[PDB]
């Protein structure tokens, strides 16, 4: 690019996720993006991988890493969502080695 | 900015690089603990309550990079 | 990033860049979860399907860079 880039997006529902791909969606992943109707545009691309997925808490005002940019099918394509590593779900693991 | 060297690499024992990138996650234990500044600072990992409440349909996440 | 905007300085402080150092080539992204821990996509370090088996020796990281 030319400067760090930022893009905000909606966690999309299971069913709508599964429906957008041939590939097997697991418990460890989540899609996010605007449905083709929602008007708003944008997404992740290559070399974006690994990048963080963060959400700002209302409770405290600290950010949390919600997922990891895990995979796709192109970029900005109507009808396709972006797959994300479900951080909360591999946290026991993350625990284990850091504390190890 | 700051360049850093790696000491170790940890890959989810059950990554599925073979079927469908399931458990796509790796930890890189740095060599030398970095110093926080106004442009260097950790991020939070959630707890069962922040995930349950936040992880939701239409709830916006922010994404950043150089891709 | 497809159809985003340029961050503001300070905004994304956990923002870590996986690079190669041999010659230089940005590969992936990541985040600082600590002073001695980086969180990344497993498939950034190793995806055989595409010839990709980096080892510690293979990479360097750049903290706190925001173009």
């Amino acid at each position: 690019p030319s400067v760090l880039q930022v893009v905000n997006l909606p966690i999309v529902e299971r069913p709508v996720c599964k429906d957008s791909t041939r590939i097997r969606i697991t418990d460890n992943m989540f899609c996010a993006g605007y449905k083709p109707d929602e008007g708003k545009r944008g997404d992740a691309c290559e070399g974006d991988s690994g990048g963080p997925f963060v959400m700002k808490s209302p409770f405290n005002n600290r950010w949390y890493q919600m997922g990891i940019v895990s995979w796709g099918e192109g970029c900005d394509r109507d009808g396709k969502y972006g797959f994300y590593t479900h951080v909360f779900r591999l946290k026991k693991w993350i625990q284990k080695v850091i504390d190890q | 900015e700051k360049i850093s060297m790696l000491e170790k690499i940890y890959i989810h024992p059950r990554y599925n690089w073979r079927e469908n990138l399931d458990r796509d996650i790796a930890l890189m234990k740095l060599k030398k603990p970095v110093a926080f500044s106004d442009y260097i600072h950790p991020v939070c990992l959630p707890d069962r309550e922040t995930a349950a409440s936040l992880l939701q349909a239409g709830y916006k996440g922010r994404v950043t990079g150089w891709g | 990033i497809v159809e985003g905007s340029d961050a503001e300085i300070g905004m994304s402080p956990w923002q870590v860049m996986l690079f190669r150092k041999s010659p230089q080539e940005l590969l992936c992204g990541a985040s600082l979860i600590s002073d001695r821990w980086v969180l990344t996509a497993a498939h950034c370090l190793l995806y055989p399907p595409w010839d990709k088996n980096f080892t510690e020796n293979d990479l360097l990281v750049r903290i706190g860079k925001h173009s």
Partner: peptide, 28 residues
Amino acid sequence: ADCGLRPLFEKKSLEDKTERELLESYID
């Protein structure tokens, strides 16, 4: 323990240009 707070924003009691967008979208 000082995870997620950001020296150039949350510490200077400050806000970014699109962080209100994240917050409006939730329900706690």
